[PDB]
Amino acid sequence: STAFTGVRDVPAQQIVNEMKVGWNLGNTMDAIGGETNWGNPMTTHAMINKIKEAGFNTLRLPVTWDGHMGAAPEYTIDQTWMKRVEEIANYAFDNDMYVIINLHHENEWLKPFYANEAQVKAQLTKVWTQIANNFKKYGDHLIFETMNEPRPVGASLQWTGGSYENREVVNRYNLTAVNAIRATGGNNATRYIMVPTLAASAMSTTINDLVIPNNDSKVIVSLHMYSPYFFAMDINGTSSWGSDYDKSSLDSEFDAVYNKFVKNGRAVVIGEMGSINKNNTAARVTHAEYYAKSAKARGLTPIWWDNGYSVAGKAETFGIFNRSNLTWDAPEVMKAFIKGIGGSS
Amino acid sequence: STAFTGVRDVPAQQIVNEMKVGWNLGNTMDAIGGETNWGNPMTTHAMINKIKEAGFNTLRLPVTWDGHMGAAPEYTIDQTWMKRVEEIANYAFDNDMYVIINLHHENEWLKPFYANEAQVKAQLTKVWTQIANNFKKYGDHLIFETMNEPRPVGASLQWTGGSYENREVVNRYNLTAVNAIRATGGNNATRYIMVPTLAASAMSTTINDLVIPNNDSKVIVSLHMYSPYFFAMDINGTSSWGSDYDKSSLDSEFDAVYNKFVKNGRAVVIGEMGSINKNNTAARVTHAEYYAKSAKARGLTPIWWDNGYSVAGKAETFGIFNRSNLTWDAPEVMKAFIKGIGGSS
Amino acid sequence: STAFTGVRDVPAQQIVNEMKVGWNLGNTMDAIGGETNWGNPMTTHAMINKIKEAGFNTLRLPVTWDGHMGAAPEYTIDQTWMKRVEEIANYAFDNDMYVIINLHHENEWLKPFYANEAQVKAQLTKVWTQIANNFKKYGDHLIFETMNEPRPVGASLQWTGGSYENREVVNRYNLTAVNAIRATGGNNATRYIMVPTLAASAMSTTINDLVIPNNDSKVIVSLHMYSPYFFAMDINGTSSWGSDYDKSSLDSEFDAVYNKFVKNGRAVVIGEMGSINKNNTAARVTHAEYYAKSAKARGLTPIWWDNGYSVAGKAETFGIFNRSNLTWDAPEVMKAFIKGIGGSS
Amino acid sequence: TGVRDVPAQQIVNEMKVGWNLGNTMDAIGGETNWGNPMTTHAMINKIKEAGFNTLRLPVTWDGHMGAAPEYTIDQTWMKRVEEIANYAFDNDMYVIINLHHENEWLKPFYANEAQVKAQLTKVWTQIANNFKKYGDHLIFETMNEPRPVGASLQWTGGSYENREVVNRYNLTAVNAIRATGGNNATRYIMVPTLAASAMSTTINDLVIPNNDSKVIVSLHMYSPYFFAMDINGTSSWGSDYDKSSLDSEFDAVYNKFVKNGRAVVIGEMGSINKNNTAARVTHAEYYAKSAKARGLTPIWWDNGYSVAGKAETFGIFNRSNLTWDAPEVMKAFIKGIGGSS
Amino acid sequence: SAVEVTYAITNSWGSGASVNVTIKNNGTTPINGWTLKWTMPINQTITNMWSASFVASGTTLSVTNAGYNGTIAANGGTQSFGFNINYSGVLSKPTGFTVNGTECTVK
Amino acid sequence: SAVEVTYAITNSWGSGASVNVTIKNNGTTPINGWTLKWTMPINQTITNMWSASFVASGTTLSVTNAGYNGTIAANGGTQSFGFNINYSGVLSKPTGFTVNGTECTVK
Amino acid sequence: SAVEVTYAITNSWGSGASVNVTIKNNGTTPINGWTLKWTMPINQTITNMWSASFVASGTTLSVTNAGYNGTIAANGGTQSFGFNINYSGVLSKPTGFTVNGTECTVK
Amino acid sequence: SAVEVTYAITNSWGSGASVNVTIKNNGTTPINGWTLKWTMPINQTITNMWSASFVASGTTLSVTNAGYNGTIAANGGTQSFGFNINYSGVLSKPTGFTVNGTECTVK
């Protein structure tokens, strides 16, 4: 098991290299109301076995804590919920993987405005203190991700970089979260931690205004890049991907990240990406394999967003693994993604 | 007149500030087959006077030299053509403006490939030696732009960042052109010079790989940013502009330029931008004004591409000035653009 | 009291600014064989009151732990010794001062060589874990200094930059010490920490090769600068100081530190400095005042080495405060030093 | 030949190690006025043979030029400098030509700046025009040791005013050279810090004219002072402290300049004759290899004066009979530099 | 607020004055491309400005950086500009400012 | 010459005033660790200062940067600090300033 | 070409060998995120690789940087990696390489 | 120590060979101005070297960086150079290497 290996002092880039390529347990512990509330069955050790066997070395374990915790001042987290998170993490540690645990759909309380800052910081400190204490013994194969996509509420603002106020307060929250984790001591003082830009966006505005808490070299940047938008995410967008233009645009998106962070020794994980099912397997294969090698060529480790929903022609169909069957719904997409990542053997 | 005011040793950013905002004499000296061959009338002093009066302090004077020069080894430029270019420039210096002279539609000979390098450099050297020598006495209000949009030919490559080969050779061409200018001495040794990224693109790939000839502090980056593409340039693209998303995205495009260049002391001119006429004056006014002020807030001087073609509902209709009439075809857009720029008095 | 004020997240430069100017309780808890073994009286609260009253805002409290701890694996530190250090620190906290606690004369175990590295790290970790654990509740007015003057022993190496090996292992020790401190959690996860170059030397070799543990923005550099050597330290060196050359030379020493660290946002404390008594009060006054203003102009906070030995004409007579009388043996030197520092009121 | 476009560091590597024709064209009152014979092609031939690939050719132009506005330099003087440079070019060596003892007119204060700049511009335009035809083996050094006059200030970093004005003069000089165009547009150029000092104060306040990538820093480092220069200083060199301390002087230059791609030439250095040959041998060899390990090319100051026990006795070459007065010191210096074959 | 504005009178002559404005960023994030907005007191007109440019609409004033001073560094960084005004009445100062949308403390 | 000092009054209350000082460097060389000195007018005492520290000796007032703001960038860089004074008679401003020995222009 | 590849044998033991590859960029533009491609002689198989990772497809070999060594600096910069192979027969070397699409010189 | 040297044979032609050397720094501290020393096997002679220079003294070979490649970056940084040798008998490799006094591992 990779659960209790202690904590190294290597550069974060090395950790990101070993994380290699990842798979998200999406719409699960992050689902509002509970693990199976969004149509996924209860997670099993056998499922995670298949993830490892396919060639994924990282499990991102998104978790929504809102709805499982009491009120201020303690915001006490339901102990059975906490233990369930720890149990799933060990499915992956048994497979010698990396695990990332975050706070996910916390937008009801995690508001990036000066007016909210004091109360949000108080809750964020309480939340991270409890999670960190629970996982204190785990070694550097356990990575904490301080927040998911913190941003100002509102449909019109979803794909924006927010205001300077928003970006400043996100930076303040990341520092609060990191300090809360590290103050618990032990392995939490030295483990690697991912922090997002506002909305985990890779756009110039948000990557340029990111401030790394304490300049801590153990900190990794968290970005979500469902690129290119129209092919990957939009049910009404093109079903085709493969032109020289497509390849060039994708490269350039990763080039921004490489020049701002990686080439300066700041490691970066693309914690979410992927494409939906538009009955276009050949195109998704081409895209998946190119994305993987182009991202990897820039020192980036990408993590597929798998929400367990794979129906052709429906929006949000990012699922590629069949959890009930223990088979792959999109075997060709999965294999191409893994194929583009390559390896050291 | 600002023609013969000598050359200062001020920061290039100060020069860019004084350029302030600009207008392109498009589809004119850049036109294949002659000044009036692409539908514009003979250029007059009266026209330029109207440009200055409107609030523009820079004239970009794009010139296509191919078609006006002999073959190797001297590639002698027709003196009548050279002198007409200079005459037009003086229309502007008479109005105390800045003038940018470039090489424009040179794609037939200017090929950014290792195989073409030796011959292209030889031609580039001869071309710039002649231009520089002709304009040698002019002071720092004359700026040379080494090339327009150097890029590999091919429809499918139009909006790409080229190959590493292409970007390396574009960098080699910029140095060749800069050295050719500087080798003539006098004011050419110290005047400010603009150099483009590949395709003059602002995308991450091209701005990241730009190399400033000799680290020359008097060099200014040239970018062309018809943003956002769909509103501004695409005839089948939206004719609305002004949402929270629209503003955020434009800010972000400028933020990448600010972070890479401006904030590090490297000045930047947006030598071409603008919107076509989709019978959408209100949207265009909103866009033009916000573009100006967002660009300016990041130290950028934008220059409108006016090709004299302003027909509603047609592609490429960037024209806003009516040259035959000495009036404006798009008075509202023009005035909004200038208003967005502001001033010091 | 400044003992328990909590821990801020301000830049280290601001902490260094508030530290302002310091005084060492030298040849005391750092003395081999215990607090009074090198001829100083038992330290009292009244002594420290006088230090504060004279205008000093930092007490550097150097401690030699070797001689007060058991063997491997635990290296258990004597509890009486630990609590006496704490008692003395509170003399200063009662005066609203900053206090620095280090490891001082540890050369019999703390050896910067590859061959000693594993065992030294293990002992360093146990030592800092114990010290940090004892002082956990104390706020940001308590600063830990990880080591004093780690270096190869051997007379010929005394004023050298050591070998690359030595400098490499020193950086490794600093990281080990910092992680040990932070791993105890609480305020220790966030307090400010001083780390030395090899031998705490400001020479180019050693400052150029310093590596900040984890790039931690809470880390401050520790330098010892008894400059200029011949005037300040050599009983056989000149008794005079104040030429334009003297001033320029001292300026240049600080300039090296300013350009390496301070101007890049890395704060620096000169944890030891001063001059011996060559019966040259006027020269020591000129030097002390100039040192203080020259250092402060480069953002540096200086700390006088006071070993309680002030006899005119003897080597190592850095003492300026008379502990037994509670008066100043060198009142003019002390006042000039304080005067040179200035203030905000 | 022509002017290559290579990294300034490559130029400096190729310069390799140098020798100054000191107290010669820099001597007040003319070439032979300070006790050296008229320079000959044979002398420079021997310099090359010993292993030096660079001749620094210091020139004092004050005394050889007319009044404002043109400050016309005497043609015979200009021609003589060129003649000597060609002795070196014939040997495929690098040559550095500077302005040397110009202190009577070249003053780094705001009050003098307008006059000095006017003259600097005229002087460099002329030198640059005369020497334009030569390729990248000819390097211009804009000034020697510009500094405020006064003995008490000799080993200081001057005032901020002084360092600012030195930077202004370097810009003026580089622009004057560049403006003549041709080979002078791309030639490599050395610029000094104030007093050509390597101290923190002066290296930290140096501003490269236009950030020009063809600019190389000029430093003079007669280190360590007491051994190398001070007639009353120690005659011994070679302890661990000596070595570490010299390393650290070069480490300051490496970290500020070389590491960041800004090339550096130590235009002057050396030791006087204290009847201490073995010590000077140890110093010379260690100096050369320590400097080279930080990317630096050292150039020996040879003033043709080698009398044991006297101040300022840096001379190692015997110009009268074409032998070395200090054969062992010379050979150790060259040996410490090493090579590629 | 983590951003402080200092609005000061360099000189005044009854009918006109010279103003210096210092913006200080005490927050953690640099302000990359600052803009400063405020309401001028009535009966004041800006004649000319340096180290920045402006757009005036009635008493509403929007000032933009001059590119070279566009970034206000975090943790106490400043940038400053200045301008002359003509005025009548008492020489009063603005009561608030916003920098890139963030309300400032007037110091 | 190439360094300008802007000495401006933020607020005043008859017995005292608040001052903001901006130092601008228009020369080519950054000022690495600025200090600023002037002659204090007869009737004035500095009660406290921020973003800098000072030493008062006779009529002489010596101000030193606060480290984080110690470098004044070339080609128009600025750094600023402020202080409170107490005064009587007419509020006068110093008539000369020196920054690291360099005589300043006063704006 | 301005890009040089040095493909060298560190050690060989009859049935396997250790290879070291050094890529040199003599051009003016840094290579930001290098990839190296070549065709590998048959009867050679890469067993493990350090400081880089690879995709093998038949004899087609695509090698990617390890992030921390992703940029090959201009004007003579290098980056290196190594790997072990198993092989039968005569040990031979690839004779052509491309780096980010640019054909390299083999030294 | 944490410094590794890879001494590899690029090519050989019976009476001589071309060698590539890669120095890799796995420590925490950059090596600022590297030098590499080894004991030269008998009957080998370096005929020329690139990206570095050398001094041969007895059995000892001392190699010095070429300035532009003088810093070996920490945490896996490399720098490389090469040279040609003439040799007779068996082509053997140096046994030990030291870089700035630190004994290296031979990969």
Side-chain angles (χ1 to χ4, degrees), chain C residues 156-157 159-162 167 203-206 208 230 244-245 248-249 251-253 255-256 259-260 263 298, chain D residues 152-153 155-158 163 199-202 204-205 226 240-241 244 247-249 251-252 254-256 259:
Chain C
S156 74
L157 302 179
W159 296 101
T160 72
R167 294 190 301 279
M203 80 177 82
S204 320
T205 305
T206 56
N208 288 349
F230 285 115
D244 294 337
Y245 170 79
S248 164
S249 301
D251 279 358
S252 190
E253 290 191 56
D255 285 342
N259 301 96
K260 171 50 59 176
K263 85 179 299 180
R298 281 85 183 160
Chain D
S152 77
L153 303 181
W155 298 108
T156 72
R163 297 186 300 277
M199 72 176 72
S200 311
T201 299
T202 53
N204 292 336
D205 283 4
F226 290 123
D240 297 336
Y241 171 79
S244 163
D247 283 359
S248 194
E249 298 200 48
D251 287 346
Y254 185 78
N255 185 261
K256 163 57 65 183
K259 173 168 190 164

Side-chain angles (χ1 to χ4, degrees), chain H residues 28-64:
Chain H
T28 190
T29 310
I31 297 171
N32 288 308
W34 67 262
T35 59
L36 172 68
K37 188 192 319 300
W38 71 79
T39 294
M40 256 291 260
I42 61 172
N43 301 310
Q44 300 190 358
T45 285
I46 302 186
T47 59
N48 69 317
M49 180 174 290
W50 47 93
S51 305
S53 64
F54 70 99
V55 173
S57 168
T59 41
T60 299
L61 209 286
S62 300
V63 183
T64 301

Side-chain angles (χ1 to χ4, degrees), chain D residues 52-258:
Chain D
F52 297 92
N53 200 37
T54 298
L55 170 68
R56 185 160 174 266
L57 178 52
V59 181
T60 296
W61 304 90
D62 198 14
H64 307 281
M65 65 185 126
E70 295 305 319
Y71 301 94
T72 299
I73 292 165
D74 178 271
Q75 70 202 74
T76 296
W77 181 250
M78 184 73 79
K79 281 186 54 179
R80 177 66 184 147
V81 176
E82 186 169 4
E83 185 166 43
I84 294 168
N86 275 281
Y87 297 162
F89 296 146
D90 287 351
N91 277 280
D92 194 30
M93 304 175 72
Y94 280 84
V95 172
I96 302 151
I97 296 172
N98 77 355
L99 319 187
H100 205 85
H101 294 308
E102 318 293 348
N103 314 79
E104 302 304 309
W105 63 271
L106 200 158
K107 309 177 164 189
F109 290 89
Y110 302 129
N112 303 99
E113 174 186 346
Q115 172 279 109
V116 175
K117 282 184 176 179
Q119 184 171 358
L120 252 187
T121 294
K122 287 291 166 166
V123 165
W124 270 116
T125 297
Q126 293 174 79
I127 297 165
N129 277 328
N130 191 75
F131 285 94
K132 184 183 290 182
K133 81 267 272 178
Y134 299 104
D136 59 41
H137 279 54
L138 172 58
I139 292 170
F140 293 151
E141 173 187 308
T142 59
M143 302 181 272
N144 184 48
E145 292 186 355
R147 62 161 124 241
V149 67
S152 77
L153 303 181
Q154 177 184 351
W155 298 108
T156 72
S159 66
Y160 171 82
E161 171 183 6
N162 297 149
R163 297 186 300 277
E164 164 79 8
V165 177
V166 166
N167 286 325
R168 290 184 192 173
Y169 292 167
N170 277 328
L171 178 54
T172 291
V174 167
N175 283 347
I177 291 154
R178 293 283 184 236
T180 65
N183 285 346
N184 295 333
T186 49
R187 185 179 310 289
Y188 297 83
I189 302 171
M190 286 165 55
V191 306
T193 49
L194 178 148
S197 177
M199 72 176 72
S200 311
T201 299
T202 53
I203 67 175
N204 292 336
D205 283 4
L206 178 68
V207 180
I208 306 300
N210 312 312
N211 259 79
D212 192 331
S213 67
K214 272 65 168 67
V215 168
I216 295 160
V217 180
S218 168
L219 301 174
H220 298 171
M221 310 180 62
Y222 292 85
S223 308
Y225 173 83
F226 290 123
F227 172 77
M229 187 165 260
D230 190 351
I231 186 65
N232 296 301
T234 181
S235 303
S236 306
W237 191 97
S239 67
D240 297 336
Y241 171 79
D242 288 337
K243 296 176 168 158
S244 163
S245 150
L246 191 64
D247 283 359
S248 194
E249 298 200 48
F250 301 144
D251 287 346
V253 180
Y254 185 78
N255 185 261
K256 163 57 65 183
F257 297 123
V258 184

Side-chain angles (χ1 to χ4, degrees), chain A residues 213-282:
Chain A
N214 299 317
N215 246 253
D216 186 345
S217 72
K218 247 70 186 292
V219 168
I220 297 162
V221 180
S222 175
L223 305 176
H224 301 166
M225 301 179 69
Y226 295 87
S227 315
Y229 175 78
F230 287 126
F231 169 79
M233 202 157 220
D234 192 352
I235 187 61
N236 290 319
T238 178
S239 308
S240 287
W241 194 95
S243 73
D244 286 337
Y245 170 81
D246 290 332
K247 295 184 183 180
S248 165
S249 304
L250 192 61
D251 284 352
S252 187
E253 288 189 62
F254 302 141
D255 292 341
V257 178
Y258 183 81
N259 239 251
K260 170 56 69 168
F261 299 122
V262 182
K263 92 179 199 312
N264 298 128
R266 181 61 60 191
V268 181
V269 167
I270 304 168
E272 298 180 15
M273 49 71 57
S275 57
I276 64 171
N277 186 354
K278 293 171 187 165
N279 211 6
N280 55 337
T281 292

Side-chain angles (χ1 to χ4, degrees), chain A residues 13 17 255 258-259 262-263 293 296-299 339-345, chain G residues 32-35 46-49 53-55 57 64-68 70-71:
Chain A
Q13 182 64 49
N17 290 351
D255 292 341
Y258 183 81
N259 239 251
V262 182
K263 92 179 199 312
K293 63 192 226 178
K296 191 54 63 170
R298 284 103 184 136
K339 190 187 178 306
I341 291 298
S344 71
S345 312
Chain G
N32 290 311
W34 66 260
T35 55
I46 297 186
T47 57
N48 64 311
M49 181 176 292
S53 68
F54 71 94
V55 173
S57 180
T64 298
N65 70 86
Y68 58 83
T71 297

Side-chain angles (χ1 to χ4, degrees), chain C residues 21-225:
Chain C
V21 58
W23 182 87
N24 278 273
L25 189 72
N27 278 18
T28 304
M29 304 300 284
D30 50 309
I32 304 312
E35 174 174 5
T36 64
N37 197 37
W38 285 356
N40 281 300
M42 191 78 163
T43 311
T44 61
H45 204 307
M47 286 169 201
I48 309 306
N49 292 355
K50 294 294 174 174
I51 303 303
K52 176 67 173 194
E53 279 155 34
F56 296 96
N57 199 50
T58 298
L59 169 73
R60 182 165 175 263
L61 173 53
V63 181
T64 292
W65 306 88
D66 191 19
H68 306 287
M69 69 186 101
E74 295 310 309
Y75 302 94
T76 301
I77 292 165
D78 178 86
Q79 173 86 327
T80 299
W81 184 249
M82 183 71 73
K83 292 296 173 169
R84 175 60 181 156
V85 170
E86 181 174 2
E87 202 168 53
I88 291 169
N90 278 291
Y91 293 163
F93 294 137
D94 284 355
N95 281 280
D96 290 348
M97 299 171 79
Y98 282 84
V99 172
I100 297 160
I101 297 184
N102 76 359
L103 319 187
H104 201 81
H105 291 313
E106 317 291 348
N107 286 164
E108 298 307 292
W109 64 272
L110 187 61
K111 305 177 180 170
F113 291 86
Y114 298 132
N116 297 97
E117 187 192 330
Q119 175 281 324
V120 171
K121 281 181 171 179
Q123 183 172 1
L124 243 194
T125 293
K126 291 292 172 171
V127 172
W128 269 118
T129 296
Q130 291 175 81
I131 303 172
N133 268 335
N134 187 69
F135 289 91
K136 205 156 140 183
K137 266 81 141 57
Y138 291 83
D140 60 26
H141 279 68
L142 173 66
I143 293 172
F144 291 145
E145 173 187 312
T146 55
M147 298 184 284
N148 183 43
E149 292 187 359
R151 63 159 82 237
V153 71
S156 74
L157 302 179
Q158 159 113 288
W159 296 101
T160 72
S163 63
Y164 172 74
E165 170 180 10
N166 302 143
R167 294 190 301 279
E168 165 75 8
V169 174
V170 165
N171 289 329
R172 296 177 190 181
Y173 291 166
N174 281 329
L175 174 59
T176 300
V178 165
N179 284 344
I181 293 169
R182 302 248 188 257
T184 61
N187 288 353
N188 293 324
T190 54
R191 82 170 69 262
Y192 298 84
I193 299 171
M194 283 165 63
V195 300
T197 49
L198 179 143
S201 178
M203 80 177 82
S204 320
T205 305
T206 56
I207 69 181
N208 288 349
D209 279 4
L210 182 63
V211 176
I212 306 291
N214 302 309
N215 203 30
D216 187 348
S217 67
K218 301 277 189 99
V219 175
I220 296 160
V221 176
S222 177
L223 306 176
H224 297 176
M225 303 174 72

